[PDB]
Design a protein around this ligand. Structure first.
Ligand SMILES: *[C@@H]1O[C@H](CO)[C@@H](O[C@@H]2O[C@H](CO)[C@@H](O[C@@H]3O[C@H](CO[C@H]4O[C@H](CO)[C@@H](O)[C@H](O)[C@@H]4O)[C@@H](O)[C@H](O[C@H]4O[C@H](CO)[C@@H](O)[C@H](O)[C@@H]4O[C@H]4O[C@H](CO)[C@@H](O)[C@H](O)[C@@H]4O[C@H]4O[C@H](CO)[C@@H](O)[C@H](O)[C@@H]4O)[C@@H]3O)[C@H](O)[C@H]2NC(C)=O)[C@H](O)[C@H]1NC(C)=O
Ligand SMILES: *[C@@H]1O[C@H](CO)[C@@H](O[C@@H]2O[C@H](CO)[C@@H](O[C@@H]3O[C@H](CO)[C@@H](O)[C@H](O[C@H]4O[C@H](CO)[C@@H](O)[C@H](O)[C@@H]4O[C@H]4O[C@H](CO)[C@@H](O)[C@H](O)[C@@H]4O[C@H]4O[C@H](CO)[C@@H](O)[C@H](O)[C@@H]4O)[C@@H]3O)[C@H](O)[C@H]2NC(C)=O)[C@H](O)[C@H]1NC(C)=O
Ligand SMILES: *[C@@H]1O[C@H](CO)[C@@H](O)[C@H](O)[C@H]1NC(C)=O
Ligand SMILES: *[C@@H]1O[C@H](CO)[C@@H](O)[C@H](O)[C@H]1NC(C)=O
Ligand code: NA
Length: 581
């Protein structure tokens, strides 16, 4: 194929194709031999060995000292301290068991997911397809099933794109640091104890074999691709050999071409292992606090605990999952939601309810979500994501709105995260302070009880503070409500309270992009719809300054502009920093 194992060659791959930007919502599942103990988290295989840990205590009391009853026993099977046989060994419903993958995929489809799939290999060294390069797999041991193939075939049968999650870098970069050393070369492969060159080759060989086996539309990667300092006390680079990363990218992108498919690979945002030229950044739980470009995604989980099922696990609400999805989508990302089947393969009813409720929202209000794109301002209101460390998912109310818009850029969806008791929705960024002319606002409609229903909104006034919209009779109850605002000739460009707006014509008219406080490089401005060479004017808000750079990313000649309107020379700007005075 055309791709070579170099950064320059693989940079040319289109990171986020249109189908992926259209998709918005997907589902995957942390289910595997790491679930067998149903204790603590999916990191149980690592922590069962940790000195003085609660997981080691539990393991020692339940199974045996981890030096005698090692993690491999969950895969190969062994009796616990009370004499019960323990093994990851799901039994198909068609064979009289409880594992019903077909039912689970129907539930996932019903949730409105447009991409779905398994964790194919976590950190624990267990490849869940029929693997020749890794004997530690569920065809050789346990259920005698190619779980990844089973899932993939069902995902395709149900008209969803296939995502496969792979976490096999941390396996040999410290996950198993507390496991006993072994001279058994098979056990070394499970526990990441092979020579590092062999481990680096195996990282690639696992990817290669898996992706040829099931032809994934998305390959999702966890950390330790190149994330120095992130592997705790283990002495090592917290990384995969650079050559092997490049060989993976070229191999996958070449197979995509061969298959006639636009494929995607993701990596953790903070990780340096891939580049945002050809791979999609995957943000930490909660996502970014702001609207980020280029297109990105984030993972989340129903569980209020672990990513893998544990006894006593608690869950978040349907409302929080839906409001979180809206928030991510408004900020120019997708949300990949993790679910957590029990070790026997059963999906708990609380999780099914959440998925049903998300699907009930998306089947009704999908117009405001699927196939849309971010506006230049993601939303308004008091309830926000802080970013950084996660605590609990976003839950908004009638005070909060999130924006999305259509591809034609003449329809703005205003989604309010609760029913206003005062029957009023006030959109600040469409008020007069926002310097917005509403002459072109042709209609305002409330989306109704079923998709394709619209209830006309008759009364609205534009104040200084906001477009003040009076709502009609409340439709059937839902977790959020959607207003559809149709303009002729395009949505107006708002002036942020503190911020700026750039324009393609010299007098603050034409195509434009609103900017918050922050840093906006050539990629940002281009994706937002105005290549910076085409900027010919800028309006800087009161209390704000803008610094223009000739360079792509805040280098080169610079110029500072205070509050007001300014003309810009064609081709003079590459990037912009917008700051509070
Ligand atoms: C996708 O991946 C790519 C590749 O990894 C990512 O690209 C990286 O992006 C980084 C963030 O933009 C960028 O880093 C910036 O580089 C600037 C240029 O650096 C080079 O030139 C300077 C000058 O010769 C050298 O000193 C420097 O060593 C480099 O060689 C730096 O100037 C940037 O530093 C400033 O910003 C950071 C915040 O990011 C601050 O911590 C830092 O203190 C600097 O602060 C000033 O400028 C910023 C404007 O960015 C202001 O916000 C801030 O208030 C500071 O203001 C003072 O100075 C400015 C003049 O600079 C002045 O006008 C102002 O009034 C203040 O006095 C920063 O380090 C990487 O270079 C870039 N890497 C590559 C390979 O391209 C990309 O982000 C990824 N995309 C996404 C979406 O994640
Ligand atoms: C005090 O403050 C100062 C100033 O802030 C600190 O200095 C900074 O220190 C950084 C860390 O050393 C330094 O970054 C390094 O810069 C070099 C030169 O550009 C760069 O090569 C380094 O990148 C490698 O190493 C990091 C791990 O730190 C990896 O994440 C990265 O992938 C690179 O790994 C490659 O090189 C390694 C050898 O260095 C190999 O071991 C590794 O396998 C890998 O090799 C492959 O890739 C190569 C291409 O990347 C390829 O050629 C090769 O063949 C292989 O394929 C790292 O970024 C900053 O430059 C430095 N800043 C300044 C201004 O000096 C200092 O740390 C502070 N002190 C303390 C105590 O904190
Ligand atoms: C593993 O092999 C090495 C190399 O021969 C040897 O030094 C070590 O003692 C062996 N481990 C055990 C537990 O015997
Ligand atoms: C919505 O949330 C905000 C922020 O917590 C709060 O100020 C407001 O009173 C809430 N509205 C209702 C109706 O509870
Ligand atoms: Na690209």
């Amino acid at each position: 194929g055309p791709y070579e194992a170099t950064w320059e060659s693989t940079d040319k791959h289109n990171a986020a194709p249109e189908w992926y930007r259209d998709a918005k919502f997907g589902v995957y599942w942390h289910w595997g031999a790491f679930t067998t103990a149903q204790y603590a988290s999916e990191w149980y295989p690592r922590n069962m060995y940790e000195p003085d840990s609660d997981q080691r205590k539990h393991h020692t009391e339940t199974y045996g000292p981890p030096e005698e009853w090692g993690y491999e026993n969950f895969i190969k099977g062994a009796k616990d301290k009370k004499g019960n046989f323990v093994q990851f060994k799901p039994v198909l419903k068609s064979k009289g068991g409880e594992f019903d993958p077909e039912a689970i995929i129907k539930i996932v489809k019903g949730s409105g997911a447009r991409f779905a799939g398994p964790v194919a290999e976590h950190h624990d060294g267990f490849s869940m397809w029929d693997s020749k390069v890794n004997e530690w797999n569920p065809v050789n041991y346990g259920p005698k099933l190619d779980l990844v193939k089973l899932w993939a075939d069902l995902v395709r049968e149900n008209d969803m794109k296939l995502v496969i999650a792979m976490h096999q870098a941390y396996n040999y970069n410290g996950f198993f640091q507390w496991a006993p050393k072994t001279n058994d070369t098979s056990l070394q492969k499970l526990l990441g104890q092979l020579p590092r060159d062999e481990e680096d080759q195996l990282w690639f060989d696992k990817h290669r074999e898996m992706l040829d086996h099931v032809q994934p539309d998305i390959i999702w990667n966890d950390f330790s691709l190149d994330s120095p300092g992130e592997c705790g006390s283990f002495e090592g680079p917290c990384a995969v050999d650079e050559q092997k990363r490049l060989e993976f990218l070229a191999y996958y992108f070449n197979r995509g071409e061969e298959w006639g498919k636009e494929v995607v690979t993701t990596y953790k945002h903070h990780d340096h292992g891939f580049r945002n030229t050809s791979a999609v950044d995957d943000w930490e739980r909660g996502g970014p606090s702001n609207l980020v470009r280029p297109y990105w995604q984030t993972d989340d989980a129903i569980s209020a605990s672990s990513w893998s099922y544990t006894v006593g696990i608690k869950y978040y609400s349907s409302k929080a999952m839906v409001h979180s999805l809206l928030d991510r989508v408004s900020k120019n990302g997708n949300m990949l939601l993790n679910i957590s089947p029990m070790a026997n393969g059963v999906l708990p009813e609380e999780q099914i309810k959440v998925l049903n409720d998300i699907g009930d929202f998306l089947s009704r209000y999908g117009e405001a979500v699927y196939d849309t794109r971010a506006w230049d301002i993601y939303g308004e209101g008091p309830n926000q994501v802080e970013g950084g460390s996660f605590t609990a998912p976003l839950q908004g109310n009638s005070s909060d709105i999130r924006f999305t818009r259509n591809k034609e850029d003449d329809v703005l969806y205003v989604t309010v995260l609760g029913w206003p008791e005062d029957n009023l929705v006030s959109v600040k960024n469409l008020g007069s302070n926002a310097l917005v002319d509403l002459e072109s606002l042709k209609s305002v409609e409330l989306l109704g009880d079923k998709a394709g229903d619209y209830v006309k909104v008759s009364e609205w006034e534009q104040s200084k503070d906001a477009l003040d919209i009076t709502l009609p009779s409340q439709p059937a109850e839902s977790l959020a409500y959607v207003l559809k605002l149709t303009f002729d000739g395009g949505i107006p460009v708002p002036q942020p309270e503190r911020g700026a707006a750039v324009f393609s014509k010299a007098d603050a008219t034409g195509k434009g992009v609103a900017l918050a406080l922050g840093t906006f490089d050539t990629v940002f401005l281009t994706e937002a719809g105005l290549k910076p060479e085409e900027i010919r004017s800028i309006r800087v808000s009161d209390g704000t300054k803008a610094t223009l750079f000739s360079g792509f990313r805040f280098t080169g000649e610079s110029k500072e502009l205070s509050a007001g309107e300014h003309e810009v020379e064609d081709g003079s700007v590459g990037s912009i920093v917008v700051s509070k005075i």
